[PDB]
């Protein structure tokens, strides 16, 4: 109904405005922290190095910024367009996650990226649907074994279907939300909260890019980097199935 | 079909590896240059400032980089707000659309925590509205097409081709309204190149949302109605790209 969709627009609109109010309340007070820290770093340096003018240090910081903006990394191995990192980057496209912690610098890069995505995303969506059905099959099949127990306990077949869905997501959650967060906690030296933040920002395909795990491989733990890719793949499909059915429940409502 | 799933996986895999090869070919040389330039800057500074060890300059650069990475600006020493009501509205939009430009980061644990639940509830809610607008937008377009379709059928073009021609027009006009029109708009408004603008448009409507390009983010612009109004486009454009 057009009448109802206008209502829905207005609702969303309120969900946005309400969001805006909260984020502003929580974040505006710290808008400037990074500037403050940069300035502290400058002033601290000047006090330690009498042979440097503020203005000279200024130029250094501009020049550093330009190079970083071109993809330089502070050195004290780190190439974001080596084969492995470029592979990862391509993944971030077709998944639509788009962390963007590394930007394309060339017009050719951008141009190519357009066609790469138009063709890549739907291609990936297909595989994802496929893995979603196959993963859900495996899960629902395993849960079916536990369902056998409930039905013998004379719990109504309607509730058993519900309990299995709860189990369906709860076990997935455990494997694809909880397990990874604990993993990344230890591996990335993030806090639990940072890790869950990352996980969920990732599996929703929001992909802010303030946190990123698997862009580069880790010596002394080879299985890490692939397992992360494997994880994103499996996790996305699990998340997708949840959204389609919760989307499924919602539209009829 | 288990056979096909495995084939598809291998295909994708090849699509990635092929992507990787290309991006590396197109980007690495530029990156390796930047890395060189950073080092040239260091070595130049050392030669001009004997009171500074290489290792000390190293820490400075790391610390500067971290702050810039947090969105500090090299130019000034310290008015406009990235979390004013309009930009916060925009930011929320970037979540539920799953676009996630991320050119402004949440700094607080509360911000992050809230953001999690805001999205879990917000994205499906938005998906619903999007389906709704998708059907309604296509309906209105299809109705408008019908009147011009009457002309083709009288011109004795087969009804099968008239359906094809209309689809061409259907997408071409949508494309015109949601791809071409915006790109030309942003070209002039953001001082981007045509290629930058299309890049932005598409990165956006695909919901990739890199965040290298963001309309209205520019600090200098006196453009309050601009940034939410662009979201009006984003809404309509997304529902139409869903097709």
């Amino acid at each position: 109904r057009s009448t109802t969709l206008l209502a829905l627009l207005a609702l969303v609109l309120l969900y946005l405005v309400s969001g805006a109010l909260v984020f502003r309340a929580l974040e505006q007070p710290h808008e400037q922290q990074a500037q403050r820290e940069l300035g502290e770093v400058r002033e601290k340096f000047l006090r330690a190095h009498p042979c440097v003018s503020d203005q000279e240090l200024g130029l250094l910081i501009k020049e550093v910024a330009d190079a970083l903006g071109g993809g330089a990394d502070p050195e004290t191995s780190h190439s974001a367009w080596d084969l492995g990192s470029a592979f990862f980057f391509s993944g971030t496209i077709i998944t639509t996650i788009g962390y963007g912690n590394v930007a394309l610098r060339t017009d050719a890069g951008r141009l190519f990226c357009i066609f790469y995505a138009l063709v890549g995303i739907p291609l990936f969506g297909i595989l994802l649907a496929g893995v979603g059905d196959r993963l859900g099959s495996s899960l629902r099949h395993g849960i079916g074994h536990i369902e056998a127990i409930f039905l013998k306990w004379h719990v109504p077949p309607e509730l058993v279907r519900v309990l299995s869905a709860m189990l369906f997501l709860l076990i997935g959650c455990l494997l694809f939300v909880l397990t990874p967060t604990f993993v990344f906690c230890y591996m990335e030296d993030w806090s639990k909260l940072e890790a869950i933040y990352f996980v969920i920002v990732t599996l929703t395909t929001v992909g802010f890019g303030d946190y990123v795990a698997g862009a580069d491989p880790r010596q002394d733990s080879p299985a890490y980097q692939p397992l992360v890719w494997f994880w994103i793949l499996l996790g996305l499909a699990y998340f997708a199935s949840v959204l389609t059915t919760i989307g499924n429940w919602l539209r009829v409502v | 079909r288990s056979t096909t799933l495995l084939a598809l996986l291998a295909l994708v895999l090849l699509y990635l590896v092929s992507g990787a090869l290309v991006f590396r070919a197109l980007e690495q040389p530029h990156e390796q240059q930047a890395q060189r330039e950073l080092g040239e800057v260091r070595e130049k500074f050392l030669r001009a400032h004997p009171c500074v060890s290489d290792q000390e300059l190293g820490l400075l650069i790391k610390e500067v980089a971290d702050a810039l990475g947090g969105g500090a600006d090299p130019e000034t020493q310290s008015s406009h707000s990235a979390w004013d009501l309009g930009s916060a509205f925009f930011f929320s939009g970037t979540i539920i659309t799953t676009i996630g430009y991320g050119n402004v980061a949440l700094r607080t644990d509360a911000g992050r925590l809230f953001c999690i639940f805001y999205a879990l509830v917000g994205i499906p809610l938005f998906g619903i509205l999007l389906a709704g607008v998708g059907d309604r937008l296509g309906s209105s377009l299809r109705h408008g097409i019908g009147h011009i379709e009457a002309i083709f059928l009288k011109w004795h073009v087969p009804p099968e081709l008239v359906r094809v021609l209309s689809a061409m027009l259907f997408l071409l006009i949508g494309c015109l309204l949601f791809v071409l029109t915006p790109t030309f708009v942003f070209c002039y408004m953001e001082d981007w190149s045509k290629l930058e603008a299309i890049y932005f448009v598409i990165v956006t409507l695909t919901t990739v949302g890199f965040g290298d390009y963001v309309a209205g983010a520019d600090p200098r612009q006196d453009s309050p109605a601009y940034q939410p109004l662009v979201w009006f486009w984003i809404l309509l454009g997304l529902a139409y790209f869903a097709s």
Partner: antibody, heavy 116, light 107 residues
Framework: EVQLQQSGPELVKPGASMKTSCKVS????????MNWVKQRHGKNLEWIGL????????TYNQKFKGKATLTVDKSSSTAYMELLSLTSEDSAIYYC?????????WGQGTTLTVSS | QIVLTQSPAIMSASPGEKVTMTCSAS?????MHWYQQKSGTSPKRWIY???KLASGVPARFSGSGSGTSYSLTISSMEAEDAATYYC?????????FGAGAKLELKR
């Protein structure tokens, strides 16, 4: 005429430690980075580490991490190196030298002899 | 831990001969420096930033190179040129030296 004047040769027992010095004159001590370099009888030169006399900052060659401690005395514009738990492997000539990219002025060196 | 290789480690020249010693780097380097050492005494900065001459140094000495390969040259050998020459780099901490090239007089 810049000059780095090192202290004389030193002779110490295995296990003991030892401190040696480098006084600068002809320029301002705190304006430049000081390094130390090891040369074991007439062979490759080894950078031990550096100190920034103005800031007290030190970094070391990983080889020498636990072995060597650099310090300065600003007032007497003098740089010090301490070497720990000496073995015969440490017997060498040690230089103080100035620089943050090239080593442009060197002390005359000091010879350390570790022996019973 | 950039590695500098001077090879050969020993060489000998008659007076009047042109001499060239080389320094190759394990990975690229923006400047090379050279020291001259005569037995008994500390090294002397001889050439720095690849091709700049230190104060004492006569013109017959020159330096060149780039990236991963650098060289020190004597246009015409003299007696007082007999010494060991070392290359060194500080394009990456930690700074490092070649193992030196000993130059004796031929006779």
């Amino acid at each position: 005429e810049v000059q780095l004047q090192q202290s004389g040769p030193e002779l110490v027992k295995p296990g003991a430690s030892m401190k040696t010095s480098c006084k600068v004159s002809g320029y301002s001590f705190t304006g430049y980075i000081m390094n130390w370099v090891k040369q074991r009888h007439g062979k490759n030169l080894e950078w031990i580490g550096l100190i920034n006399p103005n800031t007290g900052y030190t970094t070391y060659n990983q080889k020498f991490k636990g072995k060597a401690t650099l310090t300065v005395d600003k007032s007497s514009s003098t740089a010090y190196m301490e070497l720990l738990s000496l073995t015969s492997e440490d017997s060498a000539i040690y230089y103080c030298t100035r620089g943050n990219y090239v080593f442009d002025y060197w002390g005359q060196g000091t010879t350390l002899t570790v022996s019973s | 831990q950039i590695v500098l290789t001077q090879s050969p480690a020993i060489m000998s020249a008659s007076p009047g001969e042109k001499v060239t010693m080389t320094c190759s780097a394990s990975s690229s380097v923006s400047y090379m420096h050279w020291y001259q050492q005569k037995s008994g005494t500390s090294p002397k900065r001889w050439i720095y930033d690849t091709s700049k001459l230190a104060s004492g140094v006569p013109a017959r000495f020159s330096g060149s190179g780039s990236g991963t390969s650098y060289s020190l040259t004597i246009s015409s050998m003299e007696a007082e040129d007999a010494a060991t020459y070392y290359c060194q780099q500080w394009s990456n901490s930690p700074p490092t030296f070649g193992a030196g090239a000993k130059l004796e007089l031929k006779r």
